Amino acid sequence: GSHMVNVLKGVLIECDPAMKQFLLYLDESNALGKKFIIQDIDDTHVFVIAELVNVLQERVGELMDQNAFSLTQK
Amino acid sequence: GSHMVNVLKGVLIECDPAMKQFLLYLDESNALGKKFIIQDIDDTHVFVIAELVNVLQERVGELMDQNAFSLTQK
């Protein structure tokens, strides 16, 4: 490679570094069928595209029981 | 203690901090009349919002001859 240049448009999110670790865990699982974390920025940051962040919103809120993700029949 | 929580929408940049350094000076100079660089996402990452990325585009494109950010009408 030449050098790291990642410039893109979407939603930038940070809160805490523990947060980072769950986004990774969720990317591992890919429970939402979307790869939300495009690049993670300086430890505590996650870059997710605005177009699909809505899946994260539901994951953050509803994942306690489950979020509505069943397109096996729809 | 504290920690930062920043969730934001716009354009994320990643490049070596050379860009950051002109950017901070330029932010400092406020030549573009807006705060383009919203948050320094620590040392290397820069965040600039898409609303005024256009301003940055012209800054990049036109700066060779002149960056005319002074528009009384044009």
From Swiss-Prot, chains A, B:
Protein name: General transcription factor IIH subunit 5
Subunit structure as annotated in this protein's UniProt entry: Component of the 7-subunit TFIIH core complex composed of XPB/ERCC3, XPD/ERCC2, GTF2H1, GTF2H2, GTF2H3, GTF2H4 and GTF2H5, which is active in NER. The core complex associates with the 3-subunit CDK-activating kinase (CAK) module composed of CCNH/cyclin H, CDK7 and MNAT1 to form the 10-subunit holoenzyme (holo-TFIIH) active in transcription.
Organism: Homo sapiens
Keyword terms of this UniProt record: Cytoplasm, Disease variant, DNA damage, DNA repair, Ichthyosis, Nucleus, Phosphoprotein, Transcription, Transcription regulation
Function in brief: Component of the general transcription and DNA repair factor IIH (TFIIH) core complex, which is involved in general and transcription-coupled nucleotide excision repair (NER) of damaged DNA and, when complexed to CAK, in RNA transcription by RNA polymerase II. In NER, TFIIH acts by opening DNA around the lesion to allow the excision of the damaged oligonucleotide and its replacement by a new DNA fragment. In transcription, TFIIH has an essential role in transcription initiation.
Disease: Trichothiodystrophy 3, photosensitive: A form of trichothiodystrophy, an autosomal recessive disease characterized by sulfur-deficient brittle hair and multisystem variable abnormalities. The spectrum of clinical features varies from mild disease with only hair involvement to severe disease with cutaneous, neurologic and profound developmental defects. Ichthyosis, intellectual and developmental disabilities, decreased fertility, abnormal characteristics at birth, ocular abnormalities, short stature, and infections are common manifestations.
GO CC annotation: cytoplasm; nucleolus; nucleoplasm; transcription factor TFIID complex; transcription factor TFIIH core complex; transcription factor TFIIH holo complex
Modified residues (Phosphothreonine): T72
Main location as per UniProt: nucleus
Subcellular localization(s) per the UniProt record: Nucleus; Cytoplasm
BP GO terms, sorted: cellular response to gamma radiation; maturation of SSU-rRNA from tricistronic rRNA transcript (SSU-rRNA, 5.8S rRNA, LSU-rRNA); nucleotide-excision repair; nucleotide-excision repair, preincision complex assembly; transcription by RNA polymerase II; transcription elongation by RNA polymerase I; transcription initiation at RNA polymerase II promoter
Stated family: Belongs to the TFB5 family.
Classification lineage: Eukaryota, Metazoa, Chordata, Craniata, Vertebrata
Gene3D superfamilies reported in the protein's UniProt record: TFB5-like (3.30.70.1220)
